[PDB]
């Protein structure tokens, strides 16, 4: 049997609705052993290496590919050279929106500073029940959830001044 | 100026740090003027009405209240009809855990038997030197410390059968 | 169940005892959205709006209501439009000196000069390591403790010539 | 002719057999008339004087006493001044379990409030139709089944917060 | 009839072989009648007293004592007064190994903090679904299998700051 | 058999009680032949070498170890790098009070001078006929009584200007 383009879909609807517990989180803060060939991301990862922390997600969203006339009225975002729009799960079906977007920002210090190489976002985090903010280290997570999509990438720096936005497009069934 | 909610968490993990000098008490062995409307408790007493004695708490922690799931394998509490979940002293802040929970039992006549409709628990309570037993009459105490919480409750009664457990739960500011 | 008097007597003596890490800060140096109507203080705050940064408490002690008879000829503090007096931890059962006095003093510009509009007292702060000066600014500190008390006031200036002084009188259920 | 051990043993797992419909009943809500020796139960009695109502047994196993360090990783039961483990039907002849542990608790109001004097249990239980609910008065049962075993106690009180835990363990021929 | 040697090794082998489901267990947080002289321990216990909890083993592993020239570039071991050394399985039969090495490290608090007297090994522990980590409270274990080596010790501490190391080396026919 | 603890108290009372014969006796007035390391006492000595005379013991009395809070403000004893407090006969059973205090006071030339270094005590002494002072050399004493403790230090010199004050803390079973 074959699933079907309208189950990826609903599934990208069911990650969707997840949104108030998504994370994203970074770690990785030691080198590589090649620092301009990461390794291969492996699928059965659970955390990421040396995790740093979590922060809340900003904008998670059905989105599918721009077309351009047509969709300039629409807020547009930009990613991987393309253009994209978002769509609303009520119309996730009739726009063919099985793409989720996912984003949040690092504002300076909110997680230890360092540099970092490895990107991901988890959902079902569950902070310790005192805690409400958003950026949390290790010891203040009562449930990391479940790691969803990661990325192993090149090393970026974090210091005072620094906000490290990320990002990702991913489909089910790439 | 106003108490944050983290102050009442630290002077909770306070009482709690005295775990080892806390008895229970018990007291009020003849009837209240109306025994199905007793009084209402005076918070400048500083010994149970007609004392009968004290027992060494079996329990003294911070709670929560409890959650579906996240909580179902914690070390739980039933009391008032709710759930509760016992939290360590290094995980206070953390937990939001601002509740003490105190408890113990007696144990047939290992104090005078009777009815007691009085209810409480002390702190830096000391035996004579040459007492080490955790039952204790009122001619056994060397400093009864300071009495902190207590209730005037409908009577139960005593017997050499009977155990007796009882619990509170408290916070600094309710 | 009730905390008795007594009670928050001996939580008020353990604050006391904290005293040599409690900690003035100070906060929101930019107005309030009605600088006449400061907004009520929300208990669940862990810091101070735009922290300014802290001074060392220089004096922090348990106080009773001064009579006019009694404590004629001993040292008279003023607060509140009332007359209070200070009370040793030996005599504070004796006395009923369930009050807390808090209060510090910055000079000039030992912290930066602006304007403040919170105040507040934490315990438990720690200075980064090889520093001994009382006056620390966010960046200097360690650990910020626990913010214990604080209040949302009209805005105060502070200038290169100018010491500001703050006093809280608290007790522990009001 | 005499009965077997195991015969004790096989009506055990009968009567166990039967938890379904098991109930506690209490009653005799106004003083013996020796307060002090209160009669010897009447084995031809079948119902309990003055019957307050009857609560659905949350507990009825078979259970043999507990041996020293052996049985202490298992489910402990105090009682009777003895300790006792729990014994699943399949081994009751392989450990000797002849004995019936029964168990119930009434919360609160959930039965009209007073004081009690008699513990029972009873069998065949049926509900009047429509009802589902677990603590049952005398009007809302169609029918009280059969009175298997009861005792007559010194008096408990019941109020709104108090929570009266009954249990026996009997066997068939002492 | 007599066991060989052999047997011995055979039986040490099997044990090893079960290294996955081994855990050091703690437990004993309150004192010893005589905290100079514990007692013996006693062969027939399936649980240690007052448990504190279960750390997976780190090292489980044939033994057997080094011979002083030839074994002197290996990393040796040392326990009890005695150098050792490890043999795998294939060679054990050849090496004599009839000796199994345990140890675990409890770091900080992973398990509540306080003294512990009583120190063993568990084999065919399981955790409760969907439990993964290493370190668990009694709360958290579905199954605590069988308790294969213990003993009963002086009390020692656990503070956040610190890290509990225990080992046995132990022989299947001493 | 093990005596009890209680035992060692009765039988420290005992002594207590023989206070009105208890006589300080001083002896070995000539060198030690290291005197720096004086030869361990024998327990079967009945005199002590050299005797110089006995002094009826200006005190004796139950104490037990002091702590804080209790003994702050009692009758306090410093011995041996500890604190002590005086207990009453009445009361020994209740304080743990198994230990004695023993002293006397010699002053000046009321014993022949010179050195001494053995220091005990006797009860049950017997002056002479018509001797009622409390300074006794050997031909003023009828019957020595039994010497109950004693200890071999250093040597200590006795002029006619001198007061020695000697005191023993002892327990029956250390």
């Known amino acids: 049997a ?43 990862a659970t955390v990421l ?13 059905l989105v599918r590919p721009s077309k351009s006339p047509e969709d300039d009225n629409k807020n547009l975002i930009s990613y991987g050279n393309k253009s994209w729009v978002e769509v609303t799960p009520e119309n996730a079906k009739a726009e063919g929106a099985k793409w ?35 950026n949390l280290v290790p010891s203040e997570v009562e449930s990391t959830g479940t790691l969803l999509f990661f990325d192993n990438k090149q090393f970026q720096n974090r210091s005072e001044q620094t906000t490290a936005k990320e990002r990702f497009i991913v489909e089910v069934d790439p």
Chains 1, 2, 3, 4, 5, 6 share one sequence.
């Open 100 to 134: 989720v977007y996912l984003e949040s920002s690092i504002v300076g210090d909110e997680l230890p500073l360092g540099t970092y190489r490895q990107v991901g976002f988890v959902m079902d985090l569950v902070a310790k029940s005192g805690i409400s903010k958003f």
């Open 49 to 61: 290496q040396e995790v740093i922390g979590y922060k809340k997600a900003t904008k998670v969203t």
């Open 2 to 44: 074959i699933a079907t383009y309208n189950s990826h879909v609903e599934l990208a609807k069911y990650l969707v609705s997840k949104a108030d517990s998504v994370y994203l989180t970074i770690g990785k803060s030691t080198p590589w052993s090649n620092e301009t060939n990461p390794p291969q991301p492996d699928e059965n």
